[model samples]
Target: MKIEEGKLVIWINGDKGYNGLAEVGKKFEKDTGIKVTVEHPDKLEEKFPQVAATGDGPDIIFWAHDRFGGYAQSGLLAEITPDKAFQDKLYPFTWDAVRYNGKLIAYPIAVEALSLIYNKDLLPNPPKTWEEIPALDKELKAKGKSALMFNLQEPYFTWPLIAADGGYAFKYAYDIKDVGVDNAGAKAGLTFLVDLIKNKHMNADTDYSIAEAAFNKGETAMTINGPWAWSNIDTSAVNYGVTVLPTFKGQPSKPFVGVLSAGINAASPNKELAKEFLENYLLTDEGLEAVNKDKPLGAVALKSYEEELAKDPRIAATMENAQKGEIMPNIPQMSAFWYAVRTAVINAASGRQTVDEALKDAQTGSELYRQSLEIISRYLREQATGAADTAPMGASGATSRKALETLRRVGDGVQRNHETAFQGMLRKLDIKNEDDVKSLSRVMIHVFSDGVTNWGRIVTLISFGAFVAKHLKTINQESCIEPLAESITDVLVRTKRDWLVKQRGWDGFVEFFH
Candidate 1:
């Protein structure tokens, strides 16, 4: 592979950044003569995928290992084989964190897992087990405080409680067929949470920020959290301390371990330089110490950094918990897992769905949603390219309405071989009439609205309508086409009016296409 000459751009989320990244960049440039730029951007998780797929993204991405599989599967991350000496220096589990489909997609940087952080003033000594929490809760509530609180709806923080009996996201990571969410162990875990809320030992409304604020302001005695929260908590006036996650029913709880790592962008022109910097400068003792000065990030991934990591009690406790933690599954379906599991958790927490029903729903959704999104992504890319290239003159510069009209007139050219998956989806939805079409359109809007809405997702929505219209035409229900189009237009206007207006409607779509 030919290496290009250019400045390297590296991205780390603004919230959890390597404060000394620029120092590392400066030193590397001084030694190698290649320029380097580091950026900390907001909403990076949403922006990276969309831009990266188009061959326009940062040269290196410093983020969690959980995203490794999706980026690798989408062809957004490049495959690299580090030297044996380099790989052996790090903790073994850290390697497993970034390996996907038998290839190393990223170099592990730091490892973190959830632990219990408590207010020293409120609970002079933290409880060693969750079984001790109820009596403490009763004691504290008598004085207008609660013993424990955390984001009740977050699956990541609550997974240990849910898996008290062994419920899991998957029976084995990457084995999509063996979904383990609805099993007996999972039900036991969910029941434990419900009982906690029902008995008033925990707050029903506690979320991440709310829990953080409450604990920092000395409102709650303890909060289930990870090292990531230490910087903010430590800065507060509240006397705080960290401990391994408390055991329940005499058994230990296992939170997911998240490995923050660095991956080279597949489309980057500076891949060699990125590798050179990481291997030579960024992963060295001086480099790790600079980035981890005062431990703003998690414990370093290297076994050599053990003594330095032990200097902080907060991170020390997190590392102890890591010994018993499960690695977050790295897979494309993990995206679906997060969405489905979060919904299941929130629904159960709010009593909107029974434990059995909620978990079953999560299992079903996890099994199917990733496939749906993939199909949508593929079909939309084809339609966007075909429509932009073959659009007729005067039909050109069409408004959103005119664009839809042109697509309707253009027939099945883009839909050729891609028809089966779309047709199959329509069949699964049982859309035989105008009502069914409208209902599916409404459902699609809800599904896409859960996470960050991107330009590619909007493109998927447009192509979806065209695909449904094509289905209607082929099935001799040509009369349903107008209703489908009209219903979609109505829904978009009602729900996404502001977004569309910002995009300048079809005009902006034209601008983005080129």
Candidate 2:
């Protein structure tokens, strides 16, 4: 198959990134006589399987490394054309990241991590050691400016405080069974943040908007953010430098690593060409160069490129951070982890709960979501086989039996498989029934909320959390505070009874009003 002559389509997330990759597409079109096309979606990751289900999706999908697990499990992904030698060219960490369940499922493109981005004029010498921070803070504020600022509400940055003190989200990247959120180190980090917020060192009310604005205006000396924010900093009239994150209490500060990758889609007719394109160009230096031409912020996967980019202190700092960083988990269990920790960060920072209480509460949120999953799974299996034999089949009960049959299908990181369970649970109960609505909200919230591997999924969970808060005030039970926590964490302190009425046309969601 001469893929260059044939048309090949790819889907992109809204990094406003597809256009940068468009140049690479043009090169591919010129080489293969193949026409390459790119489409940017509001939510590419969520829509991947939906589009693939129709056998009409992109030949390749460009997204993060962590999400390909779900895509692979759903059988929507093809193993990359690369062999062990190809994998050997990148860092071991990069090599390990693209493989899942034993196959190298994705072609790694770039890497990202939180680096210390600081205004040079504000602190000509940023704090390189934790011990130096107090002096740095004192000096910065003496000049009528602030010291440090970051999106403390986000787990992406918050984990450094926790990890600096030897805490972690899981025992291992693959170990979903062992969550380590409430460990002493995590508690210590949470407590430290509360003190900072209380003393006005870092703003308790600062979100992405405020933090970025504050730093850009030279209101603060330093911020812990990823590379994406570096490009605009040069324009803020303040000379800036990106350095590795400051040591926290004398230990390394490790940020989460978000990997950019391109994976071949299983449904494409031009898959052979897709693999050829990726193996020959997309994962190469020229490929990365083409994609990031307009935006040079990404830290690419190739070790050689990293070596050259590292010479630029900014890209070097990100790589330094990634070297010590934990590869962010690409599993579904991460859903509970993300919402729980983000809320905990909010709780401690806002003074609603002491640090210990905040982390303990975060641990509880993770436990509750998993426990609820167990309860629902058992319920589905029992109803499917009359294992309990208590409730006889009736109108709604008929739906329960129907629900039981289908709900059992989705499990363990399969893309959108939970939609089967989500839809079944909604149909099994009377829509207007308060208990049923709350019950549905419980799983719907968690099922949809799980998987924050991309900005798209993050917005979905935050939106659903806010949606639940606004419309489902009567929907509370001691069983779930995680979704409730989202309202406060978003700091919108921000529903759904009226929401179902509006969501009627949403595909595969409940048509409760009807």
Candidate 3:
């Protein structure tokens, strides 16, 4: 079957995939006479959830392996296990990431890792161990140079240091399903970072751009970064080199690898075609070459592109002593880990608590998040099955009648408060005259007609009105106005006419009279 002859629409997360897609797309079309259309969602990670929930996802999507787990579990991903021929050609590491319960959900395109890059002109050799880092900093300081620079403010860079100290963001106990942040390894990692900050060997003030600039200017000796920083380094004056992270007390520091892969949408009409395209165009020798030439961020396939990769000295050196990298868990519980790790790292860096205490608090927060997700899952199950097994909000009973009544009351309170606030604003403006009242009435009518009942619209109108009123106070003369009493009467009559069609639609409005 000619795969390129099929109509395929793919959504990429960023510009990184654009060139690679265009190059391969052109080749695929030429070979098979099939057409391929590609689009990049402006904010893919934020937009995908809504799209997935509504079953409106694209045929093929390029996303990180870390996020695919949640989609697979939610049944938003199509099972591609039937295509054994296509699966056999993919890199084992990449293939392993997309499998859940023996079902293939995605095809990995590239693998990336973080490494330490240093300005060789400033520091001739990069540190091989964590202990050597502090001494190297002192040596640079003796020569009137900043020892090391990185974005200590961000969690991504900070977490690796913790990982180097044999710490991890989340503890996945092999025996149990429970994953949390409060592990001995995590605390040890946090403590090491805290001391690094306190001892002044590393400065938190450096951002990515500043670190690169300082390194280029011979201001700082080294910076820990990934493949993304290669183009930014000044190659003319500095003989920069990249290597695996320095081991902390003989323990290997494994940097987190961000793997990008292609997932087939469960709702896709041409599932077979999508799977074929991934195998033919994404996992093939020509396809991998196209990706490496265009994207060039990381390794495409293991053993397949070794010669092409060896062409770059720095990348070759870094990949030689590479440790087994973990795929960032893409499970629904992943969001909790990001927040927990960020909070703990910031608190530890700020000296708010010992690293151990901060990690413990972060772990507790993660567990709470997981519990909340379980509650959501139960509620959704009840909704789908029409089961009365769970109690409704504000009610100990299984029936939702009480919850419905409570919600109605809340809506009534909101409408009453809105009316009161509107009236209060008019009184504050001191519009007692008939002419002044007319002008205010016109303004209110304009605002209400433009969906002013919504929170954002109401806030905007009130703010604008307050600004105008403040300026009007300095003008002394009152604006002409007429009464809105007639308009209000008409609105009430119209509302009543519409309400007569519904038995309970206007019940709350009628109850206001009682």
Candidate 4:
């Protein structure tokens, strides 16, 4: 708790393979004379808010840019204002991923987009488009080899095809306005995968291990994965080449791109020092050079660095290909979309569901995700005050800004740890009321209440809660109702979505994320 001058803290993935970033933390301190402490969490995204809510955590966090939204929602993130000089150093497309609305949240580290990694010795030539995959596969199989294979059970590798035809989890006009995963474009792509399975070009078994084993041991000629998988390949035995995942039906294959960015914590006592460390060390020539030593895969935008450590064509190809990639949305709605999308891909491939049913089911899962957010918030609110009953799902009913004053309690603190932010949001709500809290107790309560299974009846409860939440603290009448509703709903939805993620091992949750 004695956070003083020259002190900074960072949280990053602690998996043994990811321990390299820890060295970067040490390098920052050696260069700047500012003590930088790094903590490897079992899950940085999940644990951040739990500790942050009590004001006991990182000054800076190294995580995927997509996680910024959920955390920013709870006021957990400190806005990062970089000069035009600093901003220009990062990728242009990636700049958007670091911000929510227009508020900048972090400094992007690198671009991570999946590409086609192939064995040069096996085929000598890479297929240019998905259109040619079957032809090549037939040849490979005839020669007792497999053309291309990846973790088919996971949606991350498959999403590029869906996107090639223009399928997306959520579309935004400011915030998430609609989902397009079940659209015409998505179905066409699903059919492509089904054909791959039916024609016997791809095996049903898959995982990172299987894909790595198949490609590395020369069991398969090619596999579609990101740079992270490169280190796992058996270098001495296999000759490999990297390229953009093939074009499909003449459309560019668009993979999900994510940035590994450095986020400052809103509650950090050493805020200035943390910002200084990032700007002074991590973003500079010496900083990136040292940091790049630890990161074996992925690409950076700096023209100098790109030309320098960029010797590997695999890393260079990913950077070049990422120019056409789409950044993943940082919103909490993604939690639901991933689960649904993953399931749909599986069902469609397995013959358990048609493209229509699979997509529709996935769409329904997304809706339920939103409903879960609304449901959990009210449930948490009631529990916080010891109220005995569930708030019924009804009306989107707030009237005026002069009336309500509530919180970011949900703002920056959501993403991976909604309950933590929800808990904090409720604590703030608890401070303001006598009549307001009691009134929130009821409007009307309905719908099936088997908690987990009620996703079957996923419904919206904000009847007007966004209105109350928006004005609950400050007075603002005309600040875009949709975004406000999103703020309120995100807390509950993500909280609920987290529960679902715990029960299953679906590869839908930001698998392609850096």
- Lowest lDDT 10-residue stretch of candidate 4: 397-406
Cα lDDT of candidate 3 equals 0.58
Q: Which stretches in model 4 have alpha-carbon errors above 4 Å?
A: 1-9, 13-19, 31-59, 142-144, 172-175, 234-237, 307-312, 350-352, 367-488, 495-514
lDDT by residue for model 3 (279-338), tens:
777667777667556556566643466456757866664464344435566555455455
TM-score of each: 0.68, 0.66, 0.62, 0.70
- In candidate 2, which residue ranges exceed 4 Å CA deviation? 1-18, 33-59, 129-135, 235-237, 351-358, 365-514
Please give the CA lDDT of all the candidate structures: 0.72, 0.64, 0.58, 0.64
TM-score of 2: 0.66
**Model 3's TM-score against the true structure:** 0.62
Off by over 4 Å in 1: 1-5, 29-43, 198-200, 311-313, 369-514
Poorest 10 consecutive residues by lDDT, candidate 3: 477-486
* Candidates in order: C-alpha RMSD to true structure: 13.0, 12.7, 16.4, 10.1
User: Candidates 3 and 4: which is better by lDDT?
Assistant: 4
CA error at residue 312 for candidate 1, angstroms: 4.6
- Clash pairs detected, candidate 1: none
How many clashes in candidate 2? 11
User: Model 4's lDDT to the true fold?
Assistant: 0.64
Best by lDDT: 1
Give per-residue CA lDDT, model 4, range 370-466, as digits (tens). 5434444443333233352343343221211111112212222232244454345445553243344333433212222324442222222342343
Q: Which of the two candidates, 1 or 4, achieves a greater TM-score against the reference? A: 4
**Can you give the lDDT of residue 287 in candidate 3?**
77
lDDT of 4 at 9: 75
